[PDB]
Amino acid sequence: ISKWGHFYINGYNFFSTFPIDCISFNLTTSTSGAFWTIAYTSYTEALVQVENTAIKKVTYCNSHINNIKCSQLTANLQNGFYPVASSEVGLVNKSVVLL
Amino acid sequence: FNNWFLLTNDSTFVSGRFVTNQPLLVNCLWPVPSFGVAAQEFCFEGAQF
Amino acid sequence: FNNWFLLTNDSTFVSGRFVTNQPLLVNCLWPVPSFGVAAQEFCFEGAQFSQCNGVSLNNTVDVIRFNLNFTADVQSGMGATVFSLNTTGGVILEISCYNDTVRESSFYSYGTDGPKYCYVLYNGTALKYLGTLPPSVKEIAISKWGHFYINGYNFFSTFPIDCISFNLTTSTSGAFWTIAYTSYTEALVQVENTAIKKVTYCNSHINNIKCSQLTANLQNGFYPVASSEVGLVNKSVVLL
Amino acid sequence: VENTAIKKVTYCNSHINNIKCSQLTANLQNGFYPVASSEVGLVNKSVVLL
Amino acid sequence: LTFNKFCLSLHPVGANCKFDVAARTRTNEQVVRSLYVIYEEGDNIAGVPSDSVLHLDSCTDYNIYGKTGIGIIRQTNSTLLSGLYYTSLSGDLLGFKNVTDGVVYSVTPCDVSAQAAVIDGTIVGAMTSINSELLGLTHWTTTPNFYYYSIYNYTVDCEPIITYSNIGVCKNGALVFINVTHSDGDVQPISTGNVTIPTNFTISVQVEYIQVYTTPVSIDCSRYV
Amino acid sequence: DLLGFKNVTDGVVYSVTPCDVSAQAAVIDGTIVGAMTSINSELLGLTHW
Amino acid sequence: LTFNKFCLSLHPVGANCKFDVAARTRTNEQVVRSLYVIYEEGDNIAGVP
Amino acid sequence: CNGNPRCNKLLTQYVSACQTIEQALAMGARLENMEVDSMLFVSENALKLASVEAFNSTEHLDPIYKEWPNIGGSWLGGLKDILPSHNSKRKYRSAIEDLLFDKVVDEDYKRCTGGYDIADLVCAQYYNGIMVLPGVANDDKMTMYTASLAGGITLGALGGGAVAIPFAVAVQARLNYVALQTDVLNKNQQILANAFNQAIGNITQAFGKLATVAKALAKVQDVVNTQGQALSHLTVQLQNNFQAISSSISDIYNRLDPPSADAQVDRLITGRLTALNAFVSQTLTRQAEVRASRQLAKDKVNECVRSQSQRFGFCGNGTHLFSLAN
Amino acid sequence: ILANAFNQAIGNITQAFGKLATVAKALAKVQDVVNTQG
Amino acid sequence: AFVSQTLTRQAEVRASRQLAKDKVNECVRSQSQRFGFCGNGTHLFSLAN
Ligand SMILES: *[C@@H]1O[C@H](CO)[C@@H](O[C@@H]2O[C@H](CO)[C@@H](O[C@@H]3O[C@H](CO[C@H]4O[C@H](CO)[C@@H](O)[C@H](O)[C@@H]4O)[C@@H](O)[C@H](O[C@H]4O[C@H](CO)[C@@H](O)[C@H](O)[C@@H]4O)[C@@H]3O)[C@H](O)[C@H]2NC(C)=O)[C@H](O)[C@H]1NC(C)=O
Ligand SMILES: *[C@@H]1O[C@H](CO)[C@@H](O[C@@H]2O[C@H](CO)[C@@H](O[C@@H]3O[C@H](CO[C@H]4O[C@H](CO)[C@@H](O)[C@H](O)[C@@H]4O)[C@@H](O)[C@H](O[C@H]4O[C@H](CO)[C@@H](O)[C@H](O)[C@@H]4O)[C@@H]3O)[C@H](O)[C@H]2NC(C)=O)[C@H](O)[C@H]1NC(C)=O
Ligand SMILES: *[C@@H]1O[C@H](CO)[C@@H](O[C@@H]2O[C@H](CO)[C@@H](O[C@@H]3O[C@H](CO[C@H]4O[C@H](CO)[C@@H](O)[C@H](O)[C@@H]4O)[C@@H](O)[C@H](O[C@H]4O[C@H](CO)[C@@H](O)[C@H](O)[C@@H]4O)[C@@H]3O)[C@H](O)[C@H]2NC(C)=O)[C@H](O)[C@H]1NC(C)=O
Ligand SMILES: *[C@@H]1O[C@H](CO)[C@@H](O[C@@H]2O[C@H](CO)[C@@H](O[C@@H]3O[C@H](CO)[C@@H](O)[C@H](O)[C@@H]3O)[C@H](O)[C@H]2NC(C)=O)[C@H](O)[C@H]1NC(C)=O
Ligand SMILES: *[C@@H]1O[C@H](CO)[C@@H](O[C@@H]2O[C@H](CO)[C@@H](O[C@@H]3O[C@H](CO)[C@@H](O)[C@H](O)[C@@H]3O)[C@H](O)[C@H]2NC(C)=O)[C@H](O)[C@H]1NC(C)=O
Ligand SMILES: *[C@@H]1O[C@H](CO)[C@@H](O[C@@H]2O[C@H](CO)[C@@H](O[C@@H]3O[C@H](CO)[C@@H](O)[C@H](O)[C@@H]3O)[C@H](O)[C@H]2NC(C)=O)[C@H](O)[C@H]1NC(C)=O
Ligand SMILES: *[C@@H]1O[C@H](CO)[C@@H](O[C@@H]2O[C@H](CO)[C@@H](O[C@@H]3O[C@H](CO)[C@@H](O)[C@H](O)[C@@H]3O)[C@H](O)[C@H]2NC(C)=O)[C@H](O)[C@H]1NC(C)=O
Ligand SMILES: *[C@@H]1O[C@H](CO)[C@@H](O[C@@H]2O[C@H](CO)[C@@H](O)[C@H](O)[C@H]2NC(C)=O)[C@H](O)[C@H]1NC(C)=O
Ligand SMILES: *[C@@H]1O[C@H](CO)[C@@H](O[C@@H]2O[C@H](CO)[C@@H](O)[C@H](O)[C@H]2NC(C)=O)[C@H](O)[C@H]1NC(C)=O
Ligand SMILES: *[C@@H]1O[C@H](CO)[C@@H](O[C@@H]2O[C@H](CO)[C@@H](O)[C@H](O)[C@H]2NC(C)=O)[C@H](O)[C@H]1NC(C)=O
Ligand SMILES: *[C@@H]1O[C@H](CO)[C@@H](O[C@@H]2O[C@H](CO)[C@@H](O)[C@H](O)[C@H]2NC(C)=O)[C@H](O)[C@H]1NC(C)=O
Ligand SMILES: *[C@@H]1O[C@H](CO)[C@@H](O[C@@H]2O[C@H](CO)[C@@H](O)[C@H](O)[C@H]2NC(C)=O)[C@H](O)[C@H]1NC(C)=O
Ligand SMILES: *[C@@H]1O[C@H](CO)[C@@H](O[C@@H]2O[C@H](CO)[C@@H](O)[C@H](O)[C@H]2NC(C)=O)[C@H](O)[C@H]1NC(C)=O
Ligand SMILES: CCCCCC/C=C\CCCCCCCC(=O)O
Ligand SMILES: CCCCCC/C=C\CCCCCCCC(=O)O
Ligand SMILES: CCCCCC/C=C\CCCCCCCC(=O)O
Ligand SMILES: *[C@@H]1O[C@H](CO)[C@@H](O)[C@H](O)[C@H]1NC(C)=O
Ligand SMILES: *[C@@H]1O[C@H](CO)[C@@H](O)[C@H](O)[C@H]1NC(C)=O
Ligand SMILES: *[C@@H]1O[C@H](CO)[C@@H](O)[C@H](O)[C@H]1NC(C)=O
Ligand SMILES: *[C@@H]1O[C@H](CO)[C@@H](O)[C@H](O)[C@H]1NC(C)=O
Ligand SMILES: *[C@@H]1O[C@H](CO)[C@@H](O)[C@H](O)[C@H]1NC(C)=O
């Protein structure tokens, strides 16, 4: 469930509602005695390998080597030279010149 | 990734490698044990539980 | 294909082979013999007549083609009118040629040897001027949608024609000519000097391959084809 | 132009100068070049209609 | 057709597009008015011919989850735990899932490409992936990669007129397998023991074509443009 | 491009040709010494032919 | 942004382009009016924050 | 056109381009097939001698070679990785060939129309009108060709059965061709055989997991990748809208009246024809390059494997002795 | 014998050219070259 | 595009011309010692048309 109102069941968005400020639940497994999980997650960029509509491997582009891996679409980089950027530009001053 | 899927608004990929923006930065993980009850009014303002 | 031409709305090909949809499915062929008169009020509803040479189809007729030399020996038994047209809404149009020029929205004053000026008449008055009769007319094709082709070129069009009347003869020339009731079909046509030389109908699998390859003499080899055609099929709808 | 300064100007005022301007060089190498046989100026007008 | 929002109006304000209202006479059609449309993409609202049918094992016109086409739909034993429908690299629908029970269905084209063999201006055989009659051919045989239909009486030793790789087709329509060329072998530079030396020679002539030059073209760029 | 047409009155055929055509000029030592052309007319300041 | 001429109008006559005036609610945005712009390229007039 | 009859009727005015595209592809394939067919050949006796088991036995040796235990002899340790063996998945396959075809790398189209599962990439391409002609027969012919070339070296005679000679005798003949040997008593082929065995073992180790080996691996991987990418691009070109509402002809015909639908479909037709023309041009260029490479390979086979060339530095860097092919 | 074989081979080649895998390959190659040029 | 295609063809024909020159020099004007170069078999002489 996304805070923008979208519901995904097994990965597919079947229905959407108005944006949700806050949501309530109260679930249990009764007497089955089964443990399960709840995940509070955020969006991030990653390389995902899928086999038969199932996730097999996830590589996060969180480091320079991981950035190269994501750029090359492979988790096993062969030895060699790869083009990269020397740095990123962030907060910068503004200069205006007019006649 | 047994109960984890790639979210999509359209047809789903069967096989291959893709660079995508997915909800995968796990802010928190709550394991509900056997014979346990998970009840919460969670508002989207943080998950430091 | 001596008095047969490829119909066109534009410039005409001089030489080469082209796959085109042309009025070439001959529903009926009427040979007018020497010293004979061909008179008919043909309405476009079939051409199963007793004078058809061979076997006549039951399909509807698309185009009617007159194959004859339109020389000075050609005479009409309806006077100056060569073709009487009945269009939608009961509007009568006549194609009439005279020996003298007729003013617009006027009628012939004197009512054989010389230039002939042809006009379209609606209520006995000249509506459109078509021009003089050229000395080399070999075929006149008329479609039920109102288009007229002279030697393959569409010179004028009228309202859609429900049914058309004529009454022609070759006088004392003693020349036989032809009338063809034909329908549109796809075929490969070879043209040399704006003249039809060979026609291949795509009516069989081998003919389909020939039309696809733009040649009537296929070399031995393998060619890609479709395994079948899809016709009438059920419809399936799935929704959430 | 060299360093935003004019160094050489060649006017396309002759046939050889026209070829030089077409080839973007003032020193043509020996060879064959495509050209036009003439220019069309004031001409009559002809209209043909049905 | 499916939409999330659909509205008709007589005013142009906020309209994504407009229709053309026209009057048709016996010989002419004249536009008189305009009808404006405000629409949003989605699937909440669907237009129907009048106020869920699935045909299986037969060619049909399908409209499944907004994807339309012609094909044959078959139930499968496959299990795919993620998604609703699946598409190919070119965007064609390959399969979908029934939401009620999770059963997977596959979609295949009704007609496929085939290879027709033409010898002496007639069709003698056809290679196809579907075991069905085509091109007026009735008899057929099975090969490890395809079905082969032929005018040859199938329930052969002949010269292949048309060959590709190991496959050859005879004028009677029969299918033959072509093997690699055989030769006696090469004479070895051995001078020990029993050896063979070629003695009786005839003459063979072999033809080889080689291209030497092209046909150059000069282009007047100004005259072409 | 239009190549020819016919006069409807008498059936006479007329042909249309371009007024100017492409030519090949020979340049030796920065001057024009000759020209190859399909029209027998003077061009590029050349008289003898 | 620099222009040689910039005019806003409520009439479509002579306008190069138009803006879309809309009302934004808590869940929807609806276009109500149009504001037409007549502009010319240049640098005589410049918009500033 | 994805099987749409109206799209086919529209394309009937463009049949010439499809005719040009199809003829260019069928003639290129035919020419390549006729030069490959002319290139390859086998010999029956050489194939009967070309195996590890035959080289490890003495059933084919002439009675005069009683001293030698088998055909391979001291060289067999290097020849077991090159000669075909019975412990292979396919016939006439060697260890190096299997290693190459596994490290670097179905043709049945009857399974695509079965509908027993979701179609894979090859079947999906076939649904789009793209067929890959069979190539397994070419690989089998090539492996038989190389096996026959290897086995012909030890064939003592051509007019009868499979009579064999020891490999050391052939090596000695090659040495005499290089230079007339004058020390018959002090033959030292053991050093050469040991060096050959060690080199072959190191090459096999490199292929399983030496600049020439790396260059060859890079070249074959590049060839495979280039072959795949062109078809991938051609398939992916079918998703382009070409300034139309949709890339699906069926959707266009289901959403629009025929007069507007035809105008929408014409743009897709033109774009797809342009893509096919580009693919054909690239294919023809590749085919010409591979024709030149095939001429080079034929020269190498004729002058380094079937004979001992007198050209300096043609069969490798050094004084050439013999060459084998896989 | 060599002269007779040469004469027969040349005659067969001429017959093939007027209306033998090498001859077919050469004809296909030259036709392909002409068509590609056009 | 036409120029690019023409240049590629010209390079291919240059390679073919080199092959033809080698064939003329080694099979027609002399008797080559290269095995299997002037056809399949023991070469005797070659003619050209
Ligand atoms: C299926 O389709 C639906 C519908 O299109 C998609 O839903 C969209 O989901 C995305 C996130 O994946 C939503 O994007 C977010 O929009 C929020 C609203 O943005 C407004 O406000 C910001 C400033 O606050 C403006 O810049 C912007 O123009 C809008 O006016 C934003 O608040 C979010 O931004 C913040 O969060 C992201 C992280 O999520 C940060 O990167 C940003 O910097 C910022 O902090 C965010 O961008 C989008 O609104 C949804 N659309 C709708 C219509 O609801 C589904 O994603 C799609 N599903 C799949 C699987 O593809
Ligand atoms: C020179 O230019 C003129 C003017 O454009 C062309 O004249 C057209 O000729 C074609 C035939 O060649 C005419 O096409 C026909 O239209 C008829 C009217 O169609 C309407 O009704 C049908 C349903 O009944 C609707 O589907 C359609 O949208 C229209 O509303 C149709 O009745 C005809 O269809 C039937 O006949 C054909 C065989 O002819 C069958 O294939 C069909 O299945 C069907 O049974 C037919 O399609 C067209 O109307 C003419 N246009 C005009 C404006 O009059 C000339 O053809 C052209 N000349 C040359 C040489 O190119
Ligand atoms: C390069 O050029 C060489 C020659 O310089 C070619 O090699 C020749 O290839 C041919 C074709 O394969 C060989 O001829 C074949 O011999 C087989 C065995 O021959 C028997 O009969 C003769 C009778 O005189 C005996 O001398 C001989 O010992 C054998 O007992 C035949 O079986 C072959 O017959 C074919 O035709 C009949 C008729 O239909 C069929 O039934 C057979 O199955 C078969 O198809 C054929 O006669 C010839 O021996 C080879 N000569 C040499 C010197 O090696 C190469 O092929 C060529 N290379 C390339 C790549 O083209
Ligand atoms: C939720 O459903 C999933 C299936 O989607 C259940 O997972 C399955 O659990 C069974 C029983 O433990 C597993 O069976 C085992 O199979 C292996 C073969 O790989 C075998 O070696 C074991 O001995 C055993 O038979 C099954 O594999 C497993 N499937 C997957 C994909 O993990 C899961 O148990 C269900 N959870 C609950 C709480 O019911
Ligand atoms: C209608 O006009 C056509 C011409 O467009 C007439 O056809 C022509 O008829 C003449 C006289 O029969 C033919 O002349 C013959 O020419 C051949 C040479 O090929 C010669 O061998 C014969 O001895 C004779 O001189 C002429 O070829 C022929 N032209 C064509 C194209 O067929 C036709 O006769 C006219 N019909 C009527 C009824 O007037
Ligand atoms: C790759 O090549 C290297 C040499 O470049 C091979 O290593 C060499 O192996 C031989 C034996 O095969 C060693 O020679 C000696 O052999 C006798 C055999 O009786 C033994 O008694 C001696 O103790 C000694 O091992 C030689 O020293 C050795 N050379 C080096 C530099 O290590 C290697 O085996 C080859 N690899 C493969 C996988 O074939
Ligand atoms: C194509 O080649 C074939 C052979 O592969 C040629 O047929 C052969 O023709 C010769 C004569 O040229 C026949 O030999 C004999 O010639 C003497 C001449 O005096 C004659 O008295 C004998 O009765 C006999 O004809 C030979 O048998 C024959 N071979 C075959 C298999 O038919 C053929 O002529 C060549 N074609 C051309 C157009 O050159
Ligand atoms: C075609 O025209 C001829 C010639 O005008 C018509 O023949 C006339 O027929 C009427 C009776 O209908 C007779 O009184 C006339 O004497 C005939 N004239 C001649 C010259 O013979 C003929 O009837 C017309 N055909 C049709 C079907 O109307
Ligand atoms: C032109 O065709 C129209 C077609 O309608 C003819 O009008 C019909 O004439 C018949 C004669 O039996 C009447 O029964 C119908 O009621 C008429 N229909 C209409 C709609 O008026 C008309 O007569 C034809 N014109 C000529 C001169 O023959
Ligand atoms: C999906 O599967 C369900 C069953 O799991 C199908 O529902 C059946 O539909 C038929 C035809 O209307 C009914 O006779 C049955 O009673 C239904 N079975 C149920 C509800 O359990 C449904 O048709 C399938 N959907 C498809 C094929 O699109
Ligand atoms: C080479 O072949 C010859 C025959 O051409 C062989 O000589 C024959 O050998 C057999 C088997 O021992 C004897 O029965 C014959 O009497 C021999 N014939 C003659 C004329 O001597 C010879 O043995 C073969 N040589 C080799 C090395 O195999
Ligand atoms: C087509 O040819 C006719 C003659 O067949 C030309 O008509 C002539 O025009 C000139 C100039 O006006 C008159 O002096 C003649 O008397 C006309 N001759 C006739 C009517 O027989 C006509 O000009 C030609 N059309 C062109 C050249 O476009
Ligand atoms: C093509 O020729 C090869 C080589 O002669 C044939 O291979 C033979 O196959 C049979 C059957 O398995 C074996 O018993 C022989 O030993 C093989 N011969 C050799 C020399 O290895 C092959 O069968 C032929 N293929 C066809 C389809 O006829
Ligand atoms: C700022 C760049 C200066 C020049 C850097 C030169 C060296 C590094 C890049 C080498 C590229 C090698 C290309 C071949 C592929 C490979 O072997 O990796
Ligand atoms: C469903 C198809 C299965 C595979 C069919 C293979 C055989 C038939 C086609 C051969 C193509 C030959 C291409 C070269 C040109 C030619 O010689 O005709
Ligand atoms: C009207 C043109 C008739 C033909 C003219 C032929 C001769 C002149 C042009 C020669 C072109 C040479 C091209 C190669 C480049 C060069 O050497 O200049
Ligand atoms: C902008 O400039 C100021 C000084 O004018 C400097 O202190 C500051 O770091 C600059 N900000 C940047 C470069 O982001
Ligand atoms: C449609 O399905 C029915 C049964 O529901 C069948 O009888 C009919 O033949 C089908 N029509 C086709 C396949 O055109
Ligand atoms: C136009 O034609 C007239 C004669 O009608 C002629 O004198 C004049 O030179 C022509 N003008 C041109 C060719 O520019
Ligand atoms: C699919 O299921 C059927 C029984 O419904 C069975 O006969 C068939 O073999 C199965 N196929 C596979 C591949 O499991
Ligand atoms: C084909 O062969 C079978 C063999 O049983 C025979 O019965 C049949 O008549 C043959 N058919 C033809 C058309 O010859």
Author numbering:
A (entry chain C): 429 to 527
B (entry chain C): 282 to 330
C (entry chain A): 282 to 392, 399 to 527
D (entry chain B): 478 to 527
E (entry chain A): 626 to 676, 684 to 787, 801 to 870
F (entry chain B): 724 to 772
G (entry chain C): 626 to 674
H (entry chain C): 871 to 975, 983 to 1086, 1098 to 1214
Sentences from the study reporting this entry:
FCoV-23 is a recently emerged, highly pathogenic recombinant coronavirus responsible for a widespread outbreak of feline infectious peritonitis. All coronaviruses are decorated with several copies of a homotrimeric spike (S) glycoprotein that is the target of neutralizing antibodies, drives viral entry through receptor binding and membrane fusion and contributes to pathogenesis. FCoV-23 S-long comprises an amino-terminal S1 subunit, folding as five domains designated 0 and A–D, and a C-terminal S2 subunit. Collectively, these findings identify APN as a bona fide entry receptor for FCoV-23, which seems to have broad receptor species tropism, mirroring that of CCoV-HuPn-2018.
These structures were resolved at 2.3 Å and 2.7 Å, respectively. The overall FCoV-23 S1 subunit architecture is reminiscent of that of the CCoV-HuPn-2018 S1 subunit, with which it can be superimposed with a root mean square deviation (r.m.s.d.) of 0.89 Å over 496 aligned Cα pairs (excluding D0). The FCoV-23 S2 subunit adopts a spring-loaded prefusion conformation and also closely resembles that of CCoV-HuPn-2018, with which it can be superimposed with a r.m.s.d. of 1.3 Å over 453 aligned Cα pairs. The similarity further extended to the conservation of key APN-interacting residues, including FCoV-23 S Y549/Q551 and W592 (corresponding to CCoV-HuPn-2018 residues Y543/Q545 and W586, respectively), and to the conformational masking and glycan shielding of the receptor-binding loops by the N567 oligosaccharide (topological equivalent to the CCoV-HuPn-2018 N561 glycan) from a neighbouring RBD in the closed S protein trimer.
